[PDB]
Amino acid sequence: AIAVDLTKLEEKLAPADSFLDRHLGPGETEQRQMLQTLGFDTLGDLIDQAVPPAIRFPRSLQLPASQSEYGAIAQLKSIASKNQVFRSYIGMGYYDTITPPVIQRNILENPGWYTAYTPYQAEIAQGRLEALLNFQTMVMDLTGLEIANASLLDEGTAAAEAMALSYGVSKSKANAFFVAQDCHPQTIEVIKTRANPLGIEVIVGDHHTFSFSTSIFGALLQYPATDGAVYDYRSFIDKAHQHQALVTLAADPLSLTLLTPPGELGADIAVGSTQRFGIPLGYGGPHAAYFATKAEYQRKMPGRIVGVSKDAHGNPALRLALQSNICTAQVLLAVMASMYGVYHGSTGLKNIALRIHQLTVLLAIGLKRLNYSLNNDYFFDTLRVGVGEQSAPAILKAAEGRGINLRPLVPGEVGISLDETVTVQDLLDLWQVFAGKDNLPFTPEELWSEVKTSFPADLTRQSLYLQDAVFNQYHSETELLRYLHQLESKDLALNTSMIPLGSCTMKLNATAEMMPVTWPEFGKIHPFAPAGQTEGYQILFAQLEAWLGEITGFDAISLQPNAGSQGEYAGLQVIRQYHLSRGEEQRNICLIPESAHGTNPASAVMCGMQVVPVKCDGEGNIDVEDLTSKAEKYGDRLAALMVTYPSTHGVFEATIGTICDIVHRFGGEVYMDGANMNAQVGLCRPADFGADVCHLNLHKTFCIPHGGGGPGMGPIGVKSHLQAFLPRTDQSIGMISAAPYGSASILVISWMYIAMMGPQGLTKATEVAILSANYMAKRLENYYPILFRGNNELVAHECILDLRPLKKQAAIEVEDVAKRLMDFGFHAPTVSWPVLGTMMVEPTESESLGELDRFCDAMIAIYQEAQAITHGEIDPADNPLKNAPHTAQSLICGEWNHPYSQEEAAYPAPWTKQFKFWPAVGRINNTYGDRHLVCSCEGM
Amino acid sequence: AIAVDLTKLEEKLAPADSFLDRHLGPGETEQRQMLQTLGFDTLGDLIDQAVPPAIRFPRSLQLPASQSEYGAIAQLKSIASKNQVFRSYIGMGYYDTITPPVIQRNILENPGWYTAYTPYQAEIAQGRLEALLNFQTMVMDLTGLEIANASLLDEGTAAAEAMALSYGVSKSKANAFFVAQDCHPQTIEVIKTRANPLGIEVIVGDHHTFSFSTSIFGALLQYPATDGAVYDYRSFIDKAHQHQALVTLAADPLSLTLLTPPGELGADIAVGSTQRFGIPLGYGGPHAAYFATKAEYQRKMPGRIVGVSKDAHGNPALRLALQTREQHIRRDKATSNICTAQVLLAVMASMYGVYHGSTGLKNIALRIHQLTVLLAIGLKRLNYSLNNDYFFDTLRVGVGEQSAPAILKAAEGRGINLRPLVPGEVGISLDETVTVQDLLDLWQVFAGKDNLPFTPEELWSEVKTSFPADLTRQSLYLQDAVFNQYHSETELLRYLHQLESKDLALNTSMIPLGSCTMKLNATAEMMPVTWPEFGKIHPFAPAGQTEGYQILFAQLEAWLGEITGFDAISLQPNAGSQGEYAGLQVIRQYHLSRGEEQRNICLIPESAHGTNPASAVMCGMQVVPVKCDGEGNIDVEDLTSKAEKYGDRLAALMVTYPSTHGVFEATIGTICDIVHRFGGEVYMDGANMNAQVGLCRPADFGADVCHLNLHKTFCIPHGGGGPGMGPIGVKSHLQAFLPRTDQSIGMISAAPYGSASILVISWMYIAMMGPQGLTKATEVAILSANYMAKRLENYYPILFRGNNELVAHECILDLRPLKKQAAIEVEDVAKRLMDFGFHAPTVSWPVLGTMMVEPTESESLGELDRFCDAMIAIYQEAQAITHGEIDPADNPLKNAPHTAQSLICGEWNHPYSQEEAAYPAPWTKQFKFWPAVGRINNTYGDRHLVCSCEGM
To answer: Which parts pass through the membrane (chain A)?
Structure first.
């Protein structure tokens, strides 16, 4: 009433700063210029030709009117204020930790570190590649195992990956996987959820009493246990090996500064979280999980691995080596965890752990004086305290009164996990809470004389860790600042130039969106804090669920899955559970078009489905006749079709509705991979044209930053008939991520984007993304054939450039073009996917016309360079394309013996003389790196 | 008791992360190595031999025990939470504003922008130089005037600089300066405080009724006025010109998007604050003030000015221009005492202009003006009297004596502050943050009820937002490409990144600038600056809303008092220059208070910072230099002679300790005794306090007053040339005269606590270091300086040493032999260091032909050694010239710095290789910092002064 009147009045005022105009690259003038090159007068008219009318969303999105950056921040701040920041000593896999301010400011809040994506182009990613090498080295050193990857999604899924690895190398008919009952309970549920569709039996029980009567292929043990107890696992491991099973330890990596590590205990695999290496609690994430194992299983390892190779000049250089459904991981958070190791060093890390342990021993001695029973013989940071059923509720409440959360274990027992933030003053609060009064029957300092903090020799670590120079040389703040800056300077990120990676949506990660991630009311909340303290998050989730529901047209949203791969997997699990609920167990066929992202069939197989490929036609589109024939053939067994819309070829197929009808006719569900949603928002809705479930990549379409290769979030939307089966936050599939809302803290980014854009702005973004892709295609089409065009000769949000003629004409490979683009100051687009020998270019709506033109001009110049080779005008082996990228040192030092000038090499376009980005290394030898796998700092 | 018990227990625990170990560069092993090189068994021995045992502080500093970064942040957050963030519509020269998040994150919270200092080495400072050029251009465009500088400290002091300029160019014998009574009241006080020691008569009155009967040399008018009124000042300006006076307008630069600008009105000078170009309120600062005037007054402009020149390759390049105006060359004859200014905030303000452009800026002002007109119409419906005929953002509302307190109280109940004007009148200033919902609150507060006799939208059809033709601006502004090209966030992100990449700051390598103390600006120290509880408070908010700041100030006053030994501390002065000036003002007031008005002689040793004699002249004192002896020390005999001669007239001695020569003189106590014997006060320049903290205290060895540079010794970042804070400590007998926060000197800074928000940085430093840590920092600073001197002494003579052949926290390297032997100039060495990846140390000050090197305690041994190795390599390059082994005119020293383009493009015709040019040391092959331009032609730039984007 009064509010409606204010909105009228506000609309009369001079126009205010609109976030849409900061998010978009091309303004109205630039848009009109682009449209004219395309032969359209208006964007609306172009979009009417791009999007098939039958699937066009016929109205505006029902979303809140856009807010300014200032207003949206203020609104979210009021929501955030409803959360309460307690001292949580809940433990269970998440422990408060101190992020060194220098790392918070210069990595987590630095777009130079969070805006690039996976280091596909290694020569311009040596900085984050080195940080990841440090991460691998830290994990190898602490676990005592031979190889480690460049991070997994969270502790529980890493453990599930360990189960899968163990299953693969098993040669027995053993179908059971033993999980110790004192693993973290969310880990157990994630494992059970992954085991279900594969028919794997999960046996959960006390490791002490496991009989080894039932054949197992693997076992998972928690170290220290979830209730805190530190056990000697050697005997169990020995017995498991006698029964041909691999043993995985889920091991707290901070505890491994003190405790005998998994490698020395005989464990085959180690997993865990690196969250307490200075990564915010985040109400669940994002945190990098680790995965370490024996070198003999290196070809079986999940995820990405950084390896040391050499460049064209013989110098050391890093690359992803040996290239599960996992794609996007947790790179940014692995960088933070490794920098925590670099800044603290081995001595510093051990002192942090020793202090935590000393405080926990002191805590225990005082609780004993208060006549409580202490169950753990040995512990790192976590006590199991027997208080009796009568006292447990009052203690937990008194604790809450002081803003402290403890862990309820079983009736009459309370768990307490201390951490890096804990002070002697916190200890006093704990004693007084347990005493029920403030005057204690002891003095704090009096207890120190009793403090015995050693472990038995069988559990006392002697081996060293983090001995490489990198962990010793950068302990002043100034030193670390400079190290970070040097690594950052090697990497080409979005603060330098457009990174037009097809299938990745490298759009603006706006400062206003990123800001709230590091507000303590979002970042400093334990994922299992009582609901009464997380009402701000509850509001955030409810809003995001409603908004993503409206965008997709689905009736329910699960925010849990913490990657695109996880969303696909969750979606297929929900479909599987649906068929089971109808008494249709035999439905296990998953139809997948050959063009699909590789995550799709990997996810299907993980879900116990049998993949049946569906041909794509001569235009690159889904072959409807073939789909119909396969659907008919597998009618009784059809579980699902997984479809990407628009296709991985960047095309709006007009047949999508018909395709869904066919699948439904034969009893299947339709799953839509939502990676290409940047061509859809406001223009079509998956639920409307026949999808039953989809996932969204929030790190593509909805602005979560690419993080150098992570983090992401992959929420799913489902129709009502599937809602009952959604992951838990009688019928649920269980848990897909370790935390109920996955990496909850980064969800604020997509909330901010939607709040600041509003329904018209979100739709305009989609439209401009399509305009810019089509503009680039039109500019380049006479130089590089555009491989797949939709109806009306338009593409969607990306286009595929055919580089195969250059190979025929000039013996030039796509890799040569990709490296030569570095000399022009550009990261290459997506290379050789989905079609070998091509590039897929996706500019997004956030890049200016000037930037688009520079990229096209670079490609045209490279076209002319290839023509020169074709026409014999320059040596076919010694030319800028074959020798790219050109380092400054290669141009300045030694003799210059090439048939082109140093200026032609380094400044091939005018903009490079205004600002030059220097490739840090020459072209990296890929085959050499895979042949001689070196994955730690020892090799560099 | 219980805390005592806990402290005891905590000491038993494994060592936690100590901030001291992050702040220091050299650890214990590195320190032992450096001591071995120096021939000392312990650091204690070195310090006992460096510091005269007589002035030595005989106990530990009484300061709180060190806290971790985590604990100190928590403690300050608790303090900050006591402040209340209101919607302040108080105005008076400070208005809430929206800092674009992209600028907050990538400039204000980016050490790449805030760690370097004044762009003395222009070739490695083109980024901030360009941002300053944009600032000047924005100011010129908006004011309609011909030249503008690269910032002043605040609005009131800028107006005082305008008074000084007007006095300096006056054709008459006029001694009076007219100040309109509707200038901001703090501006009036700053002006009066500056006029007092110069004997200038300040007339404060209604500009409408000024008779011009008393001759004036200048007039200051406020536009719009402090109460909001917009006046047509043309007639006044014409009359002032008829009477041979200059007119300065203190003009709100946002309002100039709509209002006819000073230049077009005929004004000679414009000053103001650029705070509302996206700079946090900051409880007073820091904000860059602007100063614009006519080209014909170039040589009299205060402060720094960026000018477009060209480099060795004929390419456009920027540099500081007309430097003989400034204190470091000209000293007592400088145009002002200003040194450190507000560069970081000028960068932010110009980026606000770049991001919003002319259209965006105008829309911000239009919307503010529309909201204010709407507010006005509503208040009239409620039967209130509205006094301003025309206004931009500020209303003067007649409410009556009886209602005014209740309205103010009701506003406070909704978390709103208004401005008390006079009894029965209330001021309201709207700003960029204001929404129609805020309007509704204001109307309901004035209505005394929630249901209004009108609806908001209904009022719109009555809104006239235009001004009379004679006040309506027609001229364009910000038409240069730079203000149009970077409006997407991604574009601005990239522009900022490209500029930042051109500049060598502390995230690259050590910048060992003597007299500057380029130590760690720790992230934890910087973090609280941008907490809203510090950044979003209006400086004239009611005391009940600022208890967190009260606590911060009390603690800082106590701690700096303990460090200096002084009885009272003033946190007001907002630069070292202001601290000196405030100190001299208090000394002057003291002599007057004793009935000793004739004391106006200020003794100043020849080595002193140019700010010293400049400050003295501004304080109405006559400078008498005191000679330095053969060994560079103050000549006690000469001091005594002059003290005797000017006995009856001796006001002060200004002394820097340790000296600007980097030496601890053992005579400092005797020197103070002599000054006191002859009736003078002793002022100590505390810019070298990084050699003193915990080791000696100025008050203990004879100083009556000192200033500290928090941006040198206490970690406020150098900001590319600002901001700073220059608090003063005084003995009890001077306390009565301190600036207002019957006897006060008045106001030195426009805001009572100057740039209050940045004081949290120094609070954090002290809290995290503790007494032993602060003292260790001083000792390591001295160790590292002596280490570098020892390493370099056989190559470059150490010009001055103290007792036991030691230096203090810095040393002077004599490069004059290189000039004699090889015709190598100090600037040659400075540019060649760029090719080694280093910013030069301080060049040619205090001694021409030398370099003064100050590493600070924050730089590692490895880094100290690389710098020494660079200087040694350069020495060998000079020796090759000397021995005739290379063309004396064509060699790396003469041609430095070497851009990548100069090496890669075109034919290479030099008797040395490109590798020798770009990679003269092995670390450059690990990480190469590229100079963005070749050597800049200085004389060409001063000959053809171009100070806006049109030239570049």
So the answer is: none
Q: Count CB neighbours of A910 within 10 A.
A: 9
Q: Do B497 and A496 touch (CB under 8 A)?
A: yes
CA–CA–CA angle B540, B541, B544 (5° rounding): 130
Closest CA to B121 of B865, B944, B829, B951: B829
Neighboring chain A residues of B522 at a CB cutoff of 8 Å: 101-102, 477
Residues 6+ apart with CB under 8 A from B388: B227, B228, B229, B230, B394, B395, B396
Q: Are A676 and A796 in contact (CB under 8 A)?
A: yes
Smallest Cα distance from B325 to chain A, Å: 33
Q: Distance (Å, rounded) from C-alpha A939 to C-alpha B9?
A: 44
Q: How many Å apart are CA B346 and CA B722, to the nearest integer?
A: 9
Helix residue ranges per DSSP H, B738-825:
759-792, 816-822
Q: Of A140, A356, A427, A124, nearest to A269 (Cα)?
A: A140
Two tokens, residue A476: 């002043």
State whether A892 and B918 contact (CB < 8 Å). yes
Cβ–Cβ below 8 Å for A511 and B70: no
The span from the CA of B138 to the CA of B479, in Å, is 10
Q: In terms of C-beta distances under 8 Å and separation of at least 24 residues, what long-range contacts does B547-552 make, across chains too? A: B547/B82, B547/B83, B548/B79, B548/B80, B548/B81, B548/B82, B548/B83, B549/B83, B549/B283, B549/B753, B549/B756, B551/B79, B551/B82, B552/B76, B552/B79, B552/B759, B552/B760, B552/B763
CA pair distance B584, B580, nearest whole angstrom: 6
Which residue type is seen at A623? Answer: D
Contacts of A409 (CB under 8 A, 6+ apart): A227, A384, A415
Enter the DSSP assignment of B767.
H
Give dist(CA A726, CA A731) in Å, integer: 8
| Residues of chain A found within 8 Å of residue B6, distances taken between Cβ atoms | 424-425, 428, 444-445
Q: What are the tokens at B154?
A: 């605040």
Strands (E), B577-698: 601-605, 622-626, 650-656, 681-686
Question: In angstroms, rounded to a whole number, what is the distance separating the alpha carbons of residues A663 and A631?
Answer: 7
Contact A9 B69 (CB under 8 A): no
Q: Residue B433 corresponds to which tokens in the numbers above?
A: 């943050």
* CA distance readout (Å), B185 to B96, B190, B226: 19, 9, 8
Cα dist from A516 to A74, A97, A513, whole Å: 11, 19, 7
| H or E element in which residue A718 lies | strand A716-718
Q: Find out whether A315 and A925 touch, Cβ atoms under 8 Å.
A: no
Given the DSSP bridges, would you call strands B681-686 and B705-708 parallel, antiparallel or unpaired? parallel
Residues of A in Cβ contact (< 8 Å) with B506:
478, 481
CB neighbours of residue B182 within 10 Å: 22
Distance CA B96, CA B537 (A): 9
Q: Which residue has the tokens 């509880």?
A: B533
Length of chain A: 940
Distance CA A346, CA A470 (A): 11
Q: In this structure, what DSSP letter does residue A893 have? A: S
Rounded Cα distance between A825 and A814, Å, is 17
Distances (CA, A) of B939 to B307, B334, B831: 11, 20, 17
CA distance A356 to A201: 38
Q: What technique determined this structure? A: X-ray
Q: Which two tokens stand for residue A857?
A: 């001009």
Structure tokens at A760: 């018209």
Residue type, A353: A
- The DSSP code for A509 is -
- State yes or no: cis peptide before A880, omega within 30 of 0: no
Helices (H) and strands (E) in chain B — how many of each? 32, 25
